[PDB]
Amino acid sequence: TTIAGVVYKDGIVLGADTRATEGMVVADKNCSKIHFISPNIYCCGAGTAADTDMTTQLISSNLELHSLSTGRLPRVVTANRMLKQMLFRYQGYIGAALVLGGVDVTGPHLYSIYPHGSTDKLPYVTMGSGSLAAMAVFEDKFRPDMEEEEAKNLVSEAIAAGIFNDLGSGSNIDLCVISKNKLDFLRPYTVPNKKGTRLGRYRCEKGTTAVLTEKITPLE
Amino acid sequence: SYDRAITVFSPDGHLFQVEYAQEAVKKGSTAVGVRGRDIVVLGVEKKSVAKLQDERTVRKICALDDNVCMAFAGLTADARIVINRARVECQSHRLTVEDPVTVEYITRYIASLKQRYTQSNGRRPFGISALIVGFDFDGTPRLYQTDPSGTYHAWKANAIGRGAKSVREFLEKNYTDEAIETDDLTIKLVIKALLEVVQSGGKNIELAVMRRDQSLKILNPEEIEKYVAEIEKEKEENE
Amino acid sequence: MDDKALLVEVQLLESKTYHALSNLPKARAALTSARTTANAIYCPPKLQATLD
Amino acid sequence: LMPGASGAEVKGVCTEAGMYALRERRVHVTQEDFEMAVAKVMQKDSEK
Amino acid sequence: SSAGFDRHITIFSPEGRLYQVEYAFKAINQGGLTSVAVRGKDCAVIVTQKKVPDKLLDSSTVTHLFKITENIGCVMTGMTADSRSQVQRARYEAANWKYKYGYEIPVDMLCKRIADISQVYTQNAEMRPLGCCMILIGIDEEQGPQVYKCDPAGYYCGFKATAAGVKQTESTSFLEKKVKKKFDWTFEQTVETAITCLSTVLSIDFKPSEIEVGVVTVENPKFRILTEAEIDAHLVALAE
Amino acid sequence: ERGYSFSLTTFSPSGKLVQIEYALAAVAGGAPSVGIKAANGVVLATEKKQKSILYDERSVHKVEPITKHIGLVYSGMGPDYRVLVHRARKLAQQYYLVYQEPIPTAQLVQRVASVMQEYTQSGGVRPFGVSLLICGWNEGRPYLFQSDPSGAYFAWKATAMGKNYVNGKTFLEKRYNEDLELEDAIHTAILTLKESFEGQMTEDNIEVGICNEAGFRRLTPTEVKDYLAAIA
Amino acid sequence: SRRYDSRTTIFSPEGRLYQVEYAMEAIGHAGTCLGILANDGVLLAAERRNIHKLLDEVFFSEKIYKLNEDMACSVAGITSDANVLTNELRLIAQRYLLQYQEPIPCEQLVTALCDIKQAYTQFGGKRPFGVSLLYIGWDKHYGFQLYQSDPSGNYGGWKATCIGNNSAAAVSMLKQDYKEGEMTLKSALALAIKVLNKTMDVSKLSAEKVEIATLTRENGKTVIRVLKQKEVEQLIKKHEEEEAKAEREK
């Protein structure tokens, strides 16, 4: 698990992998971890995935509701306020490491949210298990006001560090680019690792298994 | 919470909802119950069915235990929930003290339930009355009644419903000791009372007896026409 | 359909073209249908005199 | 042409049809006066 | 027209009306006061009068202007006892917006919320529905100034010119003739046209002690209340 | 304090719920409006006149979206509307947080109607005084529903509410059929709003919102001025 | 405050009470429904009120509501009041099914609903429901059953009952034409069309103006068929043929 984001000269770039690893066993290979908040605010989840899911449905429901009441665009500090108000109340028992990002009227805004309620604005964040390697990439090669292709390069390489250096990380890199007018969510950005092809054809045929009782019921 | 005193005193000392509820008791179907020495006999009159569709759901004679059967009059809705609470209570007695419930005890539960129900807030009192017939331990058959004020009250015979005072005037003018000699003779006294009731074109009776050891037993309408046949025959030769 | 006002226009145009092409009783009939049609319109603002 | 108003709109039309023949100065009431009248009295049926 | 307790509680008449709120509209008119607010091209002016009949009374405590938030001003008509409580509700709910959201509440959102609270009193048949009115101003980003008025009926609307109270209908009849010429309005034009509304409908030609003017302008978005010196400057500026 | 805990609406000796009978007249004094579904989506048209030139018509709105594909209008009074609007705004979210899906329009009406009938029986409250028109194109087909203060509902092809709806529905009976388009329902919706409108129907005298398979939206006075253009 | 209380709970000086009798006055208008059976299956006939030419004609039924997987009801009275009742006893059947993992006996379902209707008639200071409805269903204990609810809160076992505007006039012919156990579920259909022919004051029997649902026991299904509008009118003209020769032969 490695999620990261950055603010370039115009917008916000978000990136993650697709791995859910139950213990030391790979459960999922296509686990999307980037989630809708608003047409200008997304989030990235980490930790207890169901807690992140039921949180991010609730708050984006509250912003669909609230922005649907106000009749205008939401703000990033609103969702930041709701999350840091509720997680302090749930006292860290709900495990959710979050990356909040959105480009409102005031522009791009990025926050890192910890499950006890501590938040901060930073130009670049790395959360997850292999967040250390990606933070080394951002620290080594960060520059303010880079362009978005340099941003996609840096975020992609930063995820790739956790891909080839973390056990519980490494699959297809999901990206999203947010600007003042453009929203680009895309899951299959690259395939860094594949599966080897099979050699011995192990195909069994019909009749190699003893069946005790067969039952047929027609449908329509 | 709907806190409101409904039962209020009158300036001459009366309870209007009670005396109106007893009128609603006074228009229900007439039920007559008498006790023998070994077998009790109770029954309702004025079935007033459609006589072509279902009839097992309109039964107004229940049992609270094996030894306690119950009839009533009034409006049918309020009665059966009191029957329901009485079944939980009488089963709860066996959850307490091991014996079957005595009919005096369950009538104190009914009347004691009813009075505080007239005493509380936001509640019209009940619009029912009951004849509770029980054959207790050591085989002493007895019965009671229940006023809508909640006064349990024993008898040797009783009759409530629409047209009950004239029926009670028949019961005092016909109740002897030798009428309770034979059990079917007491059944002939009950059918004599329902025949001395009102109209009741033949099929208009539902009787149930107990030999103080059995369950309730309802005769199909063949001993109704048979006992009515020997009653009309005995009155025919007597005339 | 829903409109009534254009019916007066097309019956009036028929009453133009039958007498203009020399069909006097059918022009009288189409004009008469324009009369009993035009009897129910609340606003014939200029089509009143155009019919007249 | 009349879809059942009552027996009073019958006289309400057919008395009124003479006003058409009189306002065009006839001495015989014609059939187009009546269809010129039903669409007016039934317009009053269409009035409230 | 009437049946049952519809003359007493908030239920429907046989005409479909309800008499309690429209009884409470003229409860504003029992206050004996009329306020005017005019929105400018980059400003918003609230002018109202005051009547201090006693030298034993302190004239610093008769203010119907209330600074709700740092950039939000309001004026109250109606009765003082309901009005000050409504001001307390507005301050409290605005602070609750700032805690729940971390930014400044829009004035249509706030007046929407106060109209929602005022809906409840006429919505029930229990409570006395607050016979006083409500006027607010606001400077809004990508909207500039905007003026809102909430009645005790829970209705609200954005205004361009604003009159409320005793001379309300005549003052609005003056202001519609003021606006229907469609003149571009500067700050002191909105001040002068603001004073000449009630100065002619009321026709007082007062000295600067009997009124009070709150104001906000795009330049300094703080709601502020004028000093009687500069009020006298606008007053002698009005006298040509 | 507390409430009242007694129902102020009883059955008449004639067997009528009298406050509901008066609330229907309160709807009958409401503003006239109509709505027509025609083979791709629903057109909702209302009639909104400011009482004076001092008002901002761009401040409040009659056409109200409930979710992505559902819109709603009314014919009644103002302050009763926005409350149950906000309630429906909530009820869509309590659907969505369970099912992760937008609600069917029928499933919304099943809850809103239960709110209104639940409210007209409870103690110490006057019932509502508005009627609603609800639109939505769920699973291809559009939908057009109508509620009442008593809490029932109907599925209309086209209907009218507000003032003179008894004439407007006769106009729609002589007007509509099954095969029309959304812009056709726009045109005949202007044609029936002009039946009871004032002398001048400008871009702000009305407010029209429409559903598509793309979902519900609301018109601006630019293209609504284009619709009032070449009308009648 | 007590000046405003209308006392919907107290009795009349003649012993009765007026509120639920006014509700039972209101139940006579606005609806016409009946149920009939003598054999395998049971029919509910419902006369539609809204017959305006602009209705989408959806929701699978008008006054018919499937309660369990083997029972249903036809409802009459205030529809908005009925809506809480339908889903109200619907999860009571579901909590029976959750409680015992078994389909519910139809009678003890009806008792449980009529208790809830009985409570508002009894205390609380609450306007009761002016809703009366029938009950169809099947069980393993007594097979096909028929029950009738009343706004007072009492029920009753029947086989054939109309609660229409001319309900007693219908019952007067119901006890004039029947047979105990032999009226098969086509003869009771043709009888039912004769009944709604009588109580339907609007003549000629518009097939869109009626609703008829059947409940049969298929082996593990209990098919609750909801007949379409293509087989109504053939039964209508089927009645029309025999009534004309039946008239002319006399």
UniProtKB/Swiss-Prot annotation, chain C:
Organ and tissue specificity: Highly expressed in embryonic stem cells (ESCs). Expression decreases as ESCs differentiate.
Disulfide bonds: none
Induction trigger: By FOXO4; expression in embryonic stem cells (ESCs) is mediated by FOXO4.
Modifications after synthesis and translation: Phosphorylated by AMPK.
Subcellular localization, as worded in the UniProt entry: Nucleus; Cytoplasm, Cytosol
Role summary: Component of the 26S proteasome, a multiprotein complex involved in the ATP-dependent degradation of ubiquitinated proteins. This complex plays a key role in the maintenance of protein homeostasis by removing misfolded or damaged proteins, which could impair cellular functions, and by removing proteins whose functions are no longer required. Therefore, the proteasome participates in numerous cellular processes, including cell cycle progression, apoptosis, or DNA damage repair. In the complex, PSMD11 is required for proteasome assembly.
Entry similarity comment: Belongs to the proteasome subunit S9 family.
Subunit structure: Component of the 19S proteasome regulatory particle complex. The 26S proteasome consists of a 20S core particle (CP) and two 19S regulatory subunits (RP). The regulatory particle is made of a lid composed of 9 subunits including PSMD11, a base containing 6 ATPases and few additional components.
The name this protein goes by in its record: 26S proteasome non-ATPase regulatory subunit 11
Organism annotation: Homo sapiens (Human)
Originating gene: PSMD11
Part of the whole protein covered: 160 to 211 of 422
From Swiss-Prot, chain E:
Residues modified to Phosphoserine: S13, S59, S60
Record keywords: Acetylation, Cytoplasm, Glycoprotein, Nucleus, Phosphoprotein, Proteasome
Positions bearing N6-acetyllysine: K98, K100
A single cellular component GO annotation: proteasome core complex, alpha-subunit complex
UniProt-annotated glycosylation sites, renumbered to this chain: S1
One Gene Ontology term from the biological process aspect of the record: proteolysis involved in protein catabolic process
Compartments, as annotated in UniProt: Cytoplasm; Nucleus
Coiled coil: none
Family matches, as Gene3D superfamilies: Glutamine Phosphoribosylpyrophosphate, subunit 1, domain 1
Transmembrane portions of the chain: none
Pfam family name, one: Proteasome
InterPro entries xref list: Ntn_hydrolases_N (IPR029055), Proteasome_alpha (IPR050115), Proteasome_alpha-type (IPR023332), Proteasome_asu_N (IPR000426), Proteasome_sua/b (IPR001353), Proteasome_subunit_alpha6 (IPR034642)
Keyword Glycoprotein part of the UniProt annotation: yes
Xref: SMART domains: Proteasome_A_N (SM00948)
Phosphotyrosine found at: Y155
Superkingdom of source: Eukaryota
MF annotations from Gene Ontology: endopeptidase activity; NF-kappaB binding; purine ribonucleoside triphosphate binding; RNA binding
The family this protein is said to belong to: Belongs to the peptidase T1A family.
Description of how the protein assembles with itself and partners: The 26S proteasome consists of a 20S proteasome core and two 19S regulatory subunits. The 20S proteasome core is a barrel-shaped complex made of 28 subunits that are arranged in four stacked rings. The two outer rings are each formed by seven alpha subunits, and the two inner rings are formed by seven beta subunits. The proteolytic activity is exerted by three beta-subunits PSMB5, PSMB6 and PSMB7. Interacts with ALKBH4.
Name of the featured protein: Proteasome subunit alpha type-6
Source organism of this protein record: Homo sapiens
The gene coding this protein: PSMA6
UniProtKB/Swiss-Prot annotation, chain F:
InterPro entries per record: Ntn_hydrolases_N, Proteasome_alpha, Proteasome_alpha-type, Proteasome_asu_N, Proteasome_sua/b
Name of the protein described by the UniProt record: Proteasome subunit alpha type-2
GO-annotated cellular components: cytoplasm; cytosol; extracellular exosome; extracellular region; ficolin-1-rich granule lumen; nucleoplasm; nucleus; P-body
Highest taxon listed in the record's lineage: Eukaryota
Keyword flag Phosphoprotein: yes
Subcellular location: Cytoplasm; Nucleus
Chain positions found as N6-acetyllysine: K68, K169
Main localization, broad class: cytoplasm
Coiled-coil regions, chain positions: none
Species per Swiss-Prot/TrEMBL record: Homo sapiens (Human)
Subunit structure: The 26S proteasome consists of a 20S proteasome core and two 19S regulatory subunits. The 20S proteasome core is a barrel-shaped complex made of 28 subunits that are arranged in four stacked rings. The two outer rings are each formed by seven alpha subunits, and the two inner rings are formed by seven beta subunits. The proteolytic activity is exerted by three beta-subunits PSMB5, PSMB6 and PSMB7.
Record keyword Cytoplasm present: yes
Residues that bear Phosphoserine: S5, S12, S14
Signal peptide region: none
One biological process term in Gene Ontology: response to virus
Homology family: Belongs to the peptidase T1A family.
Gene3D superfamilies, alphabetized: Glutamine Phosphoribosylpyrophosphate, subunit 1, domain 1
Free-text function comment from the UniProt entry: Component of the 20S core proteasome complex involved in the proteolytic degradation of most intracellular proteins. This complex plays numerous essential roles within the cell by associating with different regulatory particles. Associated with two 19S regulatory particles, forms the 26S proteasome and thus participates in the ATP-dependent degradation of ubiquitinated proteins.
UniProtKB/Swiss-Prot annotation, chain G:
Protein keywords: Acetylation, Cytoplasm, Host-virus interaction, Nucleus, Phosphoprotein, Proteasome
Intracellular or extracellular location(s): Cytoplasm; Nucleus
GO biological process, one term: proteasome-mediated ubiquitin-dependent protein catabolic process
One GO cellular component, as annotated: proteasome core complex
Location of Phosphoserine modifications: S12, S74, S172
Signal peptide segment: none
Summary of subunit composition and partner proteins: The 26S proteasome consists of a 20S proteasome core and two 19S regulatory subunits. The 20S proteasome core is a barrel-shaped complex made of 28 subunits that are arranged in four stacked rings. The two outer rings are each formed by seven alpha subunits, and the two inner rings are formed by seven beta subunits. The proteolytic activity is exerted by three beta-subunits PSMB5, PSMB6 and PSMB7.
UniProt-recorded name of the protein: Proteasome subunit alpha type-4
